[PDB]
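Subject: mismatched residue count in predicted assembly?

I count 1345 residues in my input, but I want to confirm that the predicted structure covers every chain. Input:
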Amino acid sequence: SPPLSIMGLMPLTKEVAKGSIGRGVLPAVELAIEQIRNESLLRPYFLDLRLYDTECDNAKGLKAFYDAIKYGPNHLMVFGGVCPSVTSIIAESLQGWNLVQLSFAATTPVLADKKKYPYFFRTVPSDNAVNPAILKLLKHYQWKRVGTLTQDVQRFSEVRNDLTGVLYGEDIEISDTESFSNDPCTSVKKLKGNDVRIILGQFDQNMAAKVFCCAYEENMYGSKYQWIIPGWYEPSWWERKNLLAAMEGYIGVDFEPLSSKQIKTISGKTPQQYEREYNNKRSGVGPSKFHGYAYDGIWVIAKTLQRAMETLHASIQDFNYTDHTLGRIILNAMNETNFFGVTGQVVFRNGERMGTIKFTQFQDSREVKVGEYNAVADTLEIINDTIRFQGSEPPKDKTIILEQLRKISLPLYSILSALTILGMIMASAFLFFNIKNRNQKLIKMSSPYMNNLIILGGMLSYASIFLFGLDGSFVSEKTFETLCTVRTWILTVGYTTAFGAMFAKTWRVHAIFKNIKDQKLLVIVGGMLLIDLCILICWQAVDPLRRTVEKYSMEPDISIRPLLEHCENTHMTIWLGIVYAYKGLLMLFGCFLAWETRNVSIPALNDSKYIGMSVYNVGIMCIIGAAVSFLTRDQPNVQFCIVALVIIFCSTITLCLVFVPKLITLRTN
Amino acid sequence: ERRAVYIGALFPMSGGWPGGQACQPAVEMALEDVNSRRDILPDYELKLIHHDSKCDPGQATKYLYELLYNDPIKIILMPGCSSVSTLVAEAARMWNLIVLSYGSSSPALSNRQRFPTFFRTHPSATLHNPTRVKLFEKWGWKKIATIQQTTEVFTSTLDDLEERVKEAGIEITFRQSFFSDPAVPVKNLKRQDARIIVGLFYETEARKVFCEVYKERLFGKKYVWFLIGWYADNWFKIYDPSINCTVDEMTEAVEGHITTEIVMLNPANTRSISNMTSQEFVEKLTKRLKRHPEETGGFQEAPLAYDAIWALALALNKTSRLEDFNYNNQTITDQIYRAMNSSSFEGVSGHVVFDASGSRMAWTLIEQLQGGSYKKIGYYDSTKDDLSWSKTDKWIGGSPPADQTLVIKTFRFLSQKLFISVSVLSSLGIVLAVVCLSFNIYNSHVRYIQNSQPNLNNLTAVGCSLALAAVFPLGLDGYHIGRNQFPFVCQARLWLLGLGFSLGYGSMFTKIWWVHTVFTLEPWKLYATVGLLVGMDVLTLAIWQIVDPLHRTIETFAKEEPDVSILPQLEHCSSRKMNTWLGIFYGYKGLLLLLGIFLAYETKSVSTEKINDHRAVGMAIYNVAVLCLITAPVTMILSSQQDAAFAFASLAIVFSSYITLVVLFVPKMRRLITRG
Ligand SMILES: *[C@@H]1O[C@H](CO)[C@@H](O)[C@H](O[C@@H]2O[C@H](CO)[C@@H](O)[C@H](O)[C@H]2NC(C)=O)[C@H]1NC(C)=O
Ligand SMILES: *[C@@H]1O[C@H](CO)[C@@H](O[C@@H]2O[C@H](CO)[C@@H](O)[C@H](O)[C@H]2NC(C)=O)[C@H](O)[C@H]1NC(C)=O
Ligand SMILES: C[C@H](NC[C@H](O)CP(=O)(O)Cc1ccccc1)c1ccc(Cl)c(Cl)c1
Ligand SMILES: *[C@@H]1O[C@H](CO)[C@@H](O)[C@H](O)[C@H]1NC(C)=O
Ligand SMILES: *[C@@H]1O[C@H](CO)[C@@H](O)[C@H](O)[C@H]1NC(C)=O
Ligand SMILES: [Mg+2]
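Triage response: the counts match. Full output below for your records.
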């Protein structure tokens, strides 16, 4: 019968390393042709396939094409082309000879430019079909942040530049982007610094091991990091321990060589029957993962040739290459094909095919399949009980921030507030005892009111300790901003009055020793009080102290950043220095007089020695307190307790040393 | 009869470079002129078969089939463009052919592992870079920046430029690319303040990027732009409906921009092999066109088509043998390769010689824009490192700028007159001190002086004298010292002042101390009290100088302006953590200085023997304390200034010394002189 001829271009030799792709698919073509012939679908005509080698060389490829055009018979189509350097040359020279091409192994995106390559169709999906799957893997698991690593080659840039274009409508946002050529570890470090947990890699076999090693060296792996990389590598490419620990947990992506679904296809078989037929047809020839596409190519070419032969009869053996109408007919016939095949259902959205992508995961020995994403339906399917994580929750692209206050714990605040009452009760008792004996000779000899002033000062100082503690969520936020002022006022007055009296008495003594009475002491104490009153008024009226918050720590699974509050103002160094200097100078002056007058004295005043001891004690106590304050401001709990102890001892030993003898003297006499 | 010889050619007539409108007639004329003469090829005629290609590789392979498998048999193939020459040069290896292209300017065709039978006349685009760097060197530039539209030619060009510039002690800074968005890449130049710029792109990219420039104000006197020259004059006075700027706004943005170029026509009027002059050739082929030579295409490239078909005949004459050429044998082609590899002669374009990679070398030309018109500046021949300037360049600032603003460091000093008077007063002070010491030591046997401690007074005088002397090294800095003899001054200052102050105050305090004590006086005890304080002071000073010495410390404050920036640097003779030492030494002295005043305010009226001058000592102690107290904080707070921190510390010492030495020593003279 009259034959219909077809051209074939593929490597066949053994020196070329890609000859395997031309030897591991011919059995499928033989099977398909045998079936087409037996079924008798082209009644008068039959097919006749012709083989031509290229060696995957630009020159060695053109010469074969040309020789075929000259010697060989009148061809009608071109079938094949695995190497991208020669097929990209041949695909542009078809509008002149009026031919059509069908490639099943070229996965380059350039061939999608339908301005230069209008007569090019293929089945195998391109490498720019992985991103619409990565997208719906991100959405499903609620991820937003990403880190992309690009290698400096056009193969990978051709998709790195297509990824950024599909995320426009979506909400994902590119956080970082690092590129490298030979040294990936600098980029790995620049990424680990940005604190990212999502990585989208694009690199070849070796650079994978390189980046894994340098990431382990950078500690960029664990239950808080996710890996995404290609998955078309060869098994056992790792051909140490540490490396395998940084690799596990990565997801690879490829295209599905052969569907698993069981359904009746157009050849009256099923994907599981054809697999056995093929594995039994080839004995020595090794396996290639492209046969499912050749088998479908044969059937699509037959179907379209028939559908075109139909329209031709209503108007094929002498087709000189100057036939434009026939070429247009065949082209418009190929755009209307849809059926079911071992690989799935075949459709053509502007040459490019709409097929199925598949994910895979590595679990300590090899990659295992997980999910299949079907492009023509936009539906993602996952299987459970096979995917796993390092943690029990889907990691996220962020870190949790916590704000602990460090406030007091109140195991001892109550204890101290209670101990503060002993002093108050003792002071009340002593004041009453002194008020009761206001007529005896002992109470009449010593100063009448100076002791009362001292006791009042002590009680006022005692209140200050109560005011110190309230902080760290004890009171409303609007209260802390109003307690510092009253606190400092109270403490100032309390320290002022008592020491004013304890100093005026020694002054009167020293003056009498060298050369009304009760009035001059009150006057000088009032003046000392006036100084501090004016100072405090000026401050409270100019710039009060406001509550400021400080954050300083990093305690790591959410990170916690603690916060604290400080009642300060900007200009604190001058204020503090002046106040401290003024009080220290007064204390030293008072202390010197007492030492000078240790033995000498004036009659009608029996409390000279004891008041001197009190002055010494108060001076040392205040010095220690002030020193401790500057040293332990970070730790708030210990400072509070030590300051409270200091205040208690200072304000209690004084009274216990002044009144006690005057009391036991009456108790005994 | 003459045995014929055919060749094949592909001429473009439409596309991105229609260079066949004017390169076909030239080669036809060459063929007829070389066939007329009977001195080159006697019995071998030449003929040509030409096809069209439109400068796209889709038609080219179809026509190459139509031209390589149908008789007759061809020998030499001539492709025009750079997108259909690559193809044929890759493919011809299997047919054993030679290719000679007259219009391809791509640096990738210079390889010899893929293209082993390729020759051309149009030089490459890697021939501007030697000129560029030999010109940078001439004007001392070491920091460059560049931007490039996206394409293979420009990428390879910039790569070669980087390789050539990274081998003569120069460094590159920035490389920004684009396709049609020149906004952000030109805006990101000001962010780095780049001034020397080389720009590689087509005309429209220019008319756009330059409006962007004018908007961003990237031009002036500190900006130099390098460009490429084949743009047509008047390329900025043309309407641009896709542009907002105007003509006069842009004509001020492209002022004074260099531009190189390659020259194809012999600028001289010397004759050549064919006995022809450039003027006798231009008009000769202009009498053979349809449109005008300003509206046609590929006119300035014809000389390279003429000067090529002559090389072929020259190298084919030697071989003389050709009627039997099959596409399989590879000996005839090797002979022709050896013949073409040894070419040297003169043509309408000059001396043509092929380098190792097929290409040829030529002279290049330089220009510059001077008022809406280009004005030549010089030529260059990269074969003999030659050059030919003209002394016609121009600059706005009478000279060309440099890569970056240089910073000059300045040093501040004192007035140089406030020091002389203050260093003079010290001499008077020391004279008074010596006079008083002499007056007190002369009389040494009277009871009036035996009562009041003479030794203590003398010690006070010695201390004051040392303090007065210590003032000299305090102002000596800069004009009167270098970087080597600097540390010798600080030690002087310290060891003089910290000695004199204490050596005086020791007596001036211990006297009142023992007085007030007895007021609540063996001579031996008094010496121990004084010696103790000085002994303590030396300990602190020695421990400071041992475990913490002072060498130097510069201070760099704000950089004032004058294209030169000046940053002034100070010079503090300091150390590490001096605040603590100064605080210690100031407090430990303020204690005594504030205690003695009270002690004196106490023993105001007490009377004793050998304690007569106690009131005078009290007055002296009153003045010293106030002066020292005021001066120390002020000096500490004014460490930045240089004049104030000298007055407030040089007056407060001479005043104290004088008021001290003219109080407890004046009455002695006023009395012993009036009473003999
Ligand atoms: C090629 O086949 C595709 C897939 O069916 C088809 O989209 C192209 O045109 C379809 O043509 C229809 C008219 O025949 C039109 O109604 C439809 O809108 C259009 N497809 C889309 C997505 O718009 C076909 N082109 C041809 C046959 O020239
Ligand atoms: C090259 O051309 C020049 C001038 O075009 C020739 O010299 C002219 O030669 C002709 C010969 O017919 C003489 O009659 C004229 O007198 C010459 N003119 C001048 C100005 O010298 C020269 O002979 C040519 N050389 C060749 C043909 O080899
Ligand atoms: C001097 C140079 N010679 C021309 C190359 O020979 C053509 P090319 O293929 O090497 C690069 C190319 C250039 C333009 C358009 C398509 C391609 C030249 C370049 C541009 C122009 Cl506009 C002109 Cl007039 C001349
Ligand atoms: C051509 O070759 C012949 C013989 O070798 C020689 O005499 C003649 O000079 C050559 N022509 C040229 C132009 O060199
Ligand atoms: C011819 O070319 C070869 C390399 O292609 C070179 O070694 C040789 O020097 C060339 N001949 C001459 C005369 O330069
Ligand atoms: Mg020009």
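DSSP finds 21 helices and 18 strands in chain B. Marking this ticket as 'not a bug'.
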